[PDB]
Design a protein around this motif. Structure first.
Motif, short mmCIF file in Angstrom:
data_model
loop_
_atom_site.label_atom_id
_atom_site.label_comp_id
_atom_site.label_asym_id
_atom_site.label_seq_id
_atom_site.Cartn_x
_atom_site.Cartn_y
_atom_site.Cartn_z
N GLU A 150 7.74 2.22 18.04
CA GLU A 150 8.60 3.26 17.50
C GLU A 150 9.93 2.63 17.13
O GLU A 150 10.59 2.02 17.98
CB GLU A 150 8.78 4.40 18.50
CG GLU A 150 7.46 5.05 18.93
CD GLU A 150 7.62 5.95 20.16
OE1 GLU A 150 8.77 6.18 20.60
OE2 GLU A 150 6.58 6.42 20.68
N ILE A 151 10.32 2.74 15.86
CA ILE A 151 11.54 2.11 15.36
C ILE A 151 12.69 3.10 15.54
O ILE A 151 12.61 4.23 15.05
CB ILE A 151 11.40 1.69 13.89
CG1 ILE A 151 10.48 0.48 13.79
CG2 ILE A 151 12.77 1.32 13.31
CD1 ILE A 151 9.53 0.53 12.65
N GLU A 192 5.20 1.62 11.80
CA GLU A 192 5.06 1.96 13.21
C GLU A 192 3.59 2.01 13.64
O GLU A 192 3.25 1.54 14.73
CB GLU A 192 5.74 3.30 13.49
CG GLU A 192 7.26 3.25 13.34
CD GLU A 192 7.94 4.56 13.68
OE1 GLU A 192 7.61 5.59 13.05
OE2 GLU A 192 8.82 4.56 14.56
N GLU A 193 2.72 2.57 12.80
CA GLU A 193 1.29 2.51 13.10
C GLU A 193 0.78 1.07 13.13
O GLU A 193 0.01 0.69 14.03
CB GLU A 193 0.51 3.34 12.07
CG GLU A 193 0.86 4.83 12.02
CD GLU A 193 1.26 5.43 13.38
OE1 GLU A 193 0.55 5.19 14.38
OE2 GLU A 193 2.29 6.15 13.45
N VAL A 211 10.99 6.94 4.36
CA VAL A 211 10.65 7.65 5.59
C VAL A 211 9.18 7.42 5.93
O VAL A 211 8.82 7.07 7.06
CB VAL A 211 10.97 9.15 5.47
CG1 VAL A 211 10.23 9.95 6.54
CG2 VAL A 211 12.46 9.40 5.54
N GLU A 212 8.32 7.56 4.92
CA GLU A 212 6.89 7.37 5.12
C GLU A 212 6.54 5.91 5.39
O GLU A 212 5.60 5.62 6.14
CB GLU A 212 6.14 7.87 3.88
CG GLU A 212 4.64 7.91 4.03
CD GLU A 212 4.19 9.13 4.79
OE1 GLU A 212 4.94 10.12 4.74
OE2 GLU A 212 3.10 9.10 5.40
N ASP A 219 11.80 6.20 -3.05
CA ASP A 219 12.93 7.06 -2.73
C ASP A 219 13.00 7.26 -1.23
O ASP A 219 12.19 6.71 -0.46
CB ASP A 219 12.84 8.42 -3.44
CG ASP A 219 11.58 9.20 -3.09
OD1 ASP A 219 10.94 8.94 -2.05
OD2 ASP A 219 11.23 10.11 -3.87
N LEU A 232 12.09 9.65 0.76
CA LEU A 232 10.91 10.10 1.49
C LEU A 232 9.82 9.04 1.52
O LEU A 232 9.12 8.91 2.54
CB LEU A 232 10.40 11.41 0.89
CG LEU A 232 11.37 12.59 0.94
CD1 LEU A 232 10.59 13.89 0.97
CD2 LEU A 232 12.27 12.53 2.16
N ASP A 233 9.62 8.28 0.43
CA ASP A 233 8.74 7.11 0.50
C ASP A 233 9.11 6.21 1.67
O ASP A 233 8.25 5.83 2.47
CB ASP A 233 8.79 6.28 -0.80
CG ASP A 233 8.10 6.94 -1.97
OD1 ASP A 233 6.95 7.41 -1.79
OD2 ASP A 233 8.67 6.94 -3.09
N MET A 276 7.06 5.11 9.02
CA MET A 276 5.91 5.56 9.80
C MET A 276 4.77 4.56 9.74
O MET A 276 4.14 4.25 10.75
CB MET A 276 5.40 6.92 9.30
CG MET A 276 6.44 7.84 8.70
SD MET A 276 7.00 9.18 9.78
CE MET A 276 5.88 10.46 9.25
N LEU A 298 0.83 -1.20 0.00
CA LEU A 298 0.00 0.00 0.00
C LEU A 298 0.86 1.26 0.00
O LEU A 298 0.55 2.23 -0.70
CB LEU A 298 -0.97 0.00 1.19
CG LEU A 298 -1.59 -1.29 1.72
CD1 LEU A 298 -2.13 -1.13 3.14
CD2 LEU A 298 -2.70 -1.77 0.79
N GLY A 299 1.96 1.25 0.75
CA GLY A 299 2.86 2.38 0.80
C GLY A 299 3.42 2.78 -0.55
O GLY A 299 3.13 3.87 -1.04
N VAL A 300 4.21 1.90 -1.17
CA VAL A 300 4.90 2.22 -2.42
C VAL A 300 3.96 2.00 -3.61
O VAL A 300 4.35 2.16 -4.77
CB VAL A 300 6.20 1.40 -2.57
CG1 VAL A 300 6.98 1.37 -1.25
CG2 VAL A 300 5.89 -0.01 -2.97
N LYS A 301 2.70 1.67 -3.30
CA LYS A 301 1.66 1.32 -4.26
C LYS A 301 1.55 0.12 -5.20
O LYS A 301 0.75 0.08 -6.14
CB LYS A 301 1.07 2.58 -4.92
CG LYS A 301 -0.17 2.30 -5.75
CD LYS A 301 -0.68 3.53 -6.49
CE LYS A 301 -2.12 3.29 -6.94
NZ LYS A 301 -2.22 2.08 -7.81
#
Ligand SMILES: *[C@@H](C(=O)CCCCCCCC)[C@@H](O)C(=O)NCCNC(=O)CCNC(=O)[C@H](O)C(C)(C)COP(*)(=O)O
Ligand SMILES: *[C@@H](C(=O)CCCCCCCC)[C@@H](O)C(=O)NCCNC(=O)CCNC(=O)[C@H](O)C(C)(C)COP(*)(=O)O
Lengths: 77, 405, 406, 76
Positions: A53-54, A47-48, A40-41, A35, A37-38, A44, A15-18
């Motif tokens: 928290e990593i 973690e949810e 980085v996201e 990349d 920022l992906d 997160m 789902l993140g990187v699609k």
């Protein structure tokens, strides 16, 4: 395990990187089209999903699908 | 004929000096503008350093004009006054004149006052707490609007924004106005506020320095193996860009001519450079410049990714003819929109006072920085041609090349 | 100062239309784009009307691209897509091309997202609630950065910001880049978001219409004697500025030549226009233009102070030869940063389609419009040369003149 | 600080005038150089200082320091 973590991680990452069907050896950047920022996201999102928290030094190393599963399976929550 | 553009006056308020004299001294000494910020820590951030302006600005500017200004405008304003003084321009000379203009910007307007305005709206008083002055403090064009008006500018009036290339594009655009014969003088530069409201967004991308909150003067450390991001800074700068014949006829002091201006676009990644844009940018600034670059003020922000890509591009542009390089941001920190003008001024003082300032806090170099001439000790040299770079998110690139007459 | 510059394509997302065909239809019908706003009323605001963009943008932009974008960047990106197609341009022609640039801005970045990243930081999750995409959304150059990157622009790349003159100055500077021979093509335009966070700052000044919230389509009423402030709006717009020979040699459709660009400063009042600077700006844009101005798209925001000062300046410049004048903001509201390019686009559509769009909602015409030809009903007319004014806080003035190609 | 002293400090700081050039019969616009945005800010500061609301109808009627001082005295 797979549906314990591997599948869940794999859901998280797709789902993140699609993407669809992410392979255990895949590199977020080299294979899954991500990349800095992906990722980085993506940290997160992992973690949810696991209420944890990593650490920075650890999240730095999470750049492949296995590095993600290995971190969540090999530690807490 | 197309005209020539020279710098006849400068003004600056920066983390290392409140005027060009204080800055000159700092540059020669490698003095750090970086200090610990109890505001950054109180906000929740992991970066607790910053290059703050060491000056209480309260009550320095007239109530009637400061009521419209955010801190970016304040710093740019104070810089303008020094620049007008430096250029020897009387009010009759530059005021109410359609051939005198101003191009000056900020990277982010005023995050502090956009936040204030919303926080006040949502409180018990509503509109009554907002006040009638937030729009001019928050608009992206605050720096140009808040200066053009009290200084009675009648010519061009607008801001350029291009992230951390902002004020170098301002200078370049001012030069094109002179070149086109549309203006005789354009004040060019910018300013940037210093606040957690905008700092914290940079921390959220992990772009700031996190490890040296206990050793502030070491956190900004461009080209050093253990750099962990940039040190955010605030401040302002302004230069007087003037047509050459006009400057000569009035007896002005000319620091230097602007012989080259490059502006290119990477068209690649939104947050990491490509080097390819930078290569063309420096190339287009050196086009037709028949003297070598004696000194190059790098963009160098003490980031992992940034410093290397620019050295790569530097290496491709200059062959076995490389010039000297320092990253003044190792002393100053990173003033964002105000960075380009401040570094243009640092470069102009190196040219006027014939030295090269040092890149500081390089304990352990980086392998990719090999073969390069990173000057790490103040060095006296007759410079003749200098070059300064500024780059920014969105792949925007700016280069200025400055030469003695 | 020698190359000639033409518009070869345009795109627009506006309160009166999501493309130029819809915009053309609204312009001819005098259709209002103003609606009542729940958001504004909910915020505490006295102005409950706005010019919203009536468009579901879900899925219009690639995920890896839109993640960086505020609304301002979204509107401009969609406008640029339209304009590239309308110019007949393919990636091979404009991408990875150093002779192709982009100059496009906003008036205020993203107030919504600066308040976002601050509301988050001060909340439970702190840095993790902020996330890593707030800088590109809130930075003033976000419009240019968020388009030049995914469109693989290689030439000039930056924003101009000048309050409500922003995107007019962007077009002017694009023209100068062509004139200086530094660029063959420059995409020029802007965008602005529409949000209480920014609108309440205007309400606090007394700048916004508040007396017509019950009849939203009548709140914007430039030159009407009972006008009570402007109606805030959002959107985007983009035009393709191209060097003339280049356009002719590729068989481009050319809307008009940009034959004049004025850019001046009042140096007088921060929020009220002097009129003296506008006179010079209009005069500067008319310099060397050997044909009369057939139609003038005024800045005309519906403010009591603003409208009359601009009329006074138009009188000064034109004397007894008033062009036909209308204020399209009476239909569209005020898009701030995006106003310039959208009004350049309306003027180009009036020039291409041979009509004058009406200045609507004038029940009682202000006594200062005397001797001025304010057109209140759609009028088919063969136009040749049109003018558009845009002004901003800080005394910043821009004027564009556009003329059919011989 | 009484009503008068608070009112003159507000006026003085916002218009940038020494709190002795704030004559009681001075006009904000004619004598103390207020413009229309000063007028908005002054009324908003007075409203906050004394918790009174000042309708636009009333605010146009207040042209002088004394009219302001007199308005605050007779509302609460
Ligand atoms: C400033 C800049 O351009 C952007 C902000 C200015 C406007 C602020 C307005 C706020 C409202 C600096 O970031 C800058 O100088 N950038 C130019 C390029 N230099 C540089 O060092 C590159 C920075 N990139 C990185 O550090 C990494 O590439 C990053 C952040 C993407 C990490 O992710 P990934 O690559 O590992
Ligand atoms: C837009 C503008 O210039 C500001 C843009 C801000 C960008 C975004 C910022 C986000 C925080 C309009 O304000 C505009 O187009 N202005 C130029 C035309 N002026 C005009 O119509 C008159 C404006 N002034 C007035 O109406 C009065 O001066 C007023 C009501 C503000 C104060 O009254 P006083 O002078 O009698």
């Amino acid at each position: 395990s797979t549906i314990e973590e591997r599948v869940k991680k794999i859901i998280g990452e797709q789902l993140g990187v699609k993407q669809e069907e992410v392979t255990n050896n895949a590199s977020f950047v080299e294979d899954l089209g991500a990349d800095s920022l992906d990722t980085v996201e993506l940290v997160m999102a992992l973690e949810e999903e696991f209420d944890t928290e990593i650490p920075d030094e650890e999240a730095e190393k999470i750049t492949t699908v296995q590095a993600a599963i290995d971190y969540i399976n090999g530690h807490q929550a | 004929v197309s005209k020539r553009a020279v710098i006849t006056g400068l003004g600056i308020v920066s983390s290392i000096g409140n005027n060009q004299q204080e800055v000159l001294a700092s540059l020669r000494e490698g003095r750090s503008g970086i200090t610990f910020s109890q505001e950054l820590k109180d906000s929740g951030m992991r970066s607790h350093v910053w290059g703050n302006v060491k000056l209480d600005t309260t009550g320095l500017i007239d109530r009637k004009v400061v009521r419209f200004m955010s801190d970016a405008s304040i710093y740019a304003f104070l810089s303008m006054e020094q620049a007008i003084a430096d250029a020897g321009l009387s009010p009759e000379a530059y005021q109410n004149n359609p051939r005198v203009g101003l191009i000056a910007g900020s990277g982010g307007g005023s995050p502090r006052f956009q936040v204030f305005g919303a926080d006040a709206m949502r409180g018990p008083r509503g509109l009554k707490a907002v006040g009638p002055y937030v729009v001019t403090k928050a608009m992206a064009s605050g720096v140009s609007a808040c200066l053009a008006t009290p200084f009675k500018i009648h010519g061009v009036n607008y801001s350029i924004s291009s992230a951390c290339a902002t004020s170098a594009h301002c200078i370049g655009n001012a030069v094109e106005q002179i070149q086109l014969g549309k203006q005789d003088i354009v004040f060019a530069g910018g300013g940037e506020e210093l606040c957690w409201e905008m700092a914290c967004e940079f921390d959220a991308m992990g772009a700031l320095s996190t490890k040296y909150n206990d050793t502030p003067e070491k956190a900004s450390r461009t080209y050093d193996a253990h750099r962990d991001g940039f040190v955010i800074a605030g401040g302002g700068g302004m230069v007087v860009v003037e047509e050459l014949e006009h400057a000569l006829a009035r007896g002005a002091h000319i620091y230097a001519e602007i012989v080259g201006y490059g502006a290119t676009s990477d068209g690649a990644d939104m947050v990491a450079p490509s080097g390819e844009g930078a290569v063309r940018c420096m190339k287009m600034a050196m086009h037709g410049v028949d003297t070598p670059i004696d000194y190059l003020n790098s963009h160098g922000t003490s980031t992992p990714v940034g410093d290397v890509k620019e050295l790569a591009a530097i290496r491709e542009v200059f062959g076995d003819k490389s010039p000297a390089i320092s990253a003044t941001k190792a002393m100053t920190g990173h003033s964002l929109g105000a960075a380009g003008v401040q570094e243009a001024i640092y470069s102009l003082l190196m040219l006027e006072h014939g030295f090269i300032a040092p890149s500081i806090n390089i304990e352990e170099l980086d392998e990719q920085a090999a073969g390069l001439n990173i000057v790490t000790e103040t060095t006296d040299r007759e410079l003749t041609t200098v070059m300064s770079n500024s780059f920014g998110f969105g792949g925007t690139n700016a280069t200025l090349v400055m030469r003695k007459l």
